[PDB]
């Protein structure tokens with residue numbers, strides 16, 4: 204037994220604007236194709252954890268070739284093609300014994316609860332302001348430091364200046 208070790212890994216990944224906006228009416232308030240492609244690279248063949256509201260904002264659809272977990276207090280919640288779990292503890296138990304990375308995909312409640320258990324943050328900082336109703340939550344930034352940053356390429360498909368940032372624990 205290895206009940207005294209945590210042998211999995213949690214990454215939180217998200218895109219936000221310069222106000223900290225991450226969503227509006229369930230959906231993304233911007234379109235930035237390169238970031239979606241980066242996101243798929245990080246989640247492909249891994250596990251993606253989503254709070255119920257975010258999941259439903261995506262039209263209740265799972266991304267292929269990943270395992271998605273939907274978090275909800277509702278014991279009877281079922282959706283198509285996803286695991287459903289009902290507590291942080293339950294998420295952590297799955298993550299401990301999962302062979303790949305358990306990616307925390309949001310939304311705000313999920314980030315605030317699970318970021319304390321994460322080992323890395325992948326943030327896409329979009330340098331523009333949009334209208335939204337959901338913000339990245341207040342977290343303890345004192346335990347994190349930025350270890351990498353790369354500017355994103357703008358083109359006819361990607362309209363906004365943006366940075367891809369990586370944070371690790373100090």
Ligand SMILES: NC(=O)c1ccc[n+]([C@@H]2O[C@H](COP(=O)([O-])OP(=O)(O)OC[C@H]3O[C@@H](n4cnc5c(N)ncnc54)[C@H](OP(=O)(O)O)[C@@H]3O)[C@@H](O)[C@H]2O)c1
Pocket residue numbers: 227228229253254255256257258274275276277288289290291309310311312313314316336337338
């Ligand atoms: N002006 C305002 O009214 C305003 C301000 C902020 C956001 N909102 C809105 O709220 C939504 C999304 O915000 P969000 O990013 O915080 O949503 P989210 O994190 O994606 O999902 C939140 C939900 O996941 C659940 N969950 C999270 N932790 C859990 C736990 N430890 N155990 C069991 N279930 C857990 C709940 O499902 P269950 O509820 O089924 O238990 C919960 O309500 C949007 O639809 C949006 O419009 C509006």
